[PDB]
Amino acid sequence: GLSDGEWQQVLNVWGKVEADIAGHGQEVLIRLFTGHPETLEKFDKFKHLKTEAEMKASEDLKKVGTRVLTALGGILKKKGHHEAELKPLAQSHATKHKIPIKYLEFISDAIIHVLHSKHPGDFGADAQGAMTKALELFRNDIAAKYKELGFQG
């Protein structure tokens, strides 16, 4: 797992997310869908959308982006002791949404990109490596629950 100082860097940048959770959520999702169009096909509510202007205008997209980052913030704040938070998340993503582990890798890279773009002075080289480890931890633990739930992610 991560050191105390690695967790400190992760939570320090996360604090900058809290002042505008929705605005961050929209930027993350738009980065994900533009970099990896196949990922948008998983979102039945808005898989019909084609352009970034449409994505920015979508209220459904902004609300989903808010749920995603709020749930990730909850997990991160647990500093690895997140088994209770991770449980419902694994369950829904292996049954209802069927989200391959590869797509969770794509969104991790999107979050790291957005954080670097909006808060570089709270997200230098070492804080980036710390957030990279925290998100690997997250994916690894979800993949372990996928197996049990019978989803080869």
Q: What is the binding site for ligand HEM (CB under 6 A)?
A: 39, 42-43, 45, 64, 67-68, 71-72, 89, 92, 97, 99, 103-104, 107
The least CB distance from residue 74 to ligand HEM, in Å, is: 8
Long-range (24+ apart) CB contacts under 8 A made by 97-106 are 97/42, 98/42, 98/151, 99/42, 99/153, 100/153, 101/139, 101/142, 101/143, 101/146, 101/153, 103/36, 103/39, 103/42, 104/138, 104/139, 104/142, 104/153, 105/139, 106/32, 106/35, 106/36, 106/39
Number of Cβ within 10 Å of residue 66's Cβ equals 16
What's the min distance (Å) between Cβ of 151 and ligand HEM?
Answer: 13
For 127, the 3-state DSSP assignment is helix
For ligand HEM, which is the closer residue by CB, 45 or 147? 45
Cβ of residue 31: shortest distance to ligand HEM, in angstroms? 12
Residue 104 or 122: the one with the smaller Cβ distance to ligand HEM is: 104
CB of 39 to ligand HEM, least distance (A): 4
Task: Kindly tell me which of 17 and 68 has the beta carbon lying closer to ligand HEM.
Answer: 68
CB nearer to ligand HEM: give 34 or 121: 34
Nearer CB in complex with ligand HEM: 77/121: 77
Contacts with 51 (C-beta within 8 Å, 6 or more apart), sequence order: none
Closest contact distance (angstroms) between CB of 12 and ligand HEM is 19
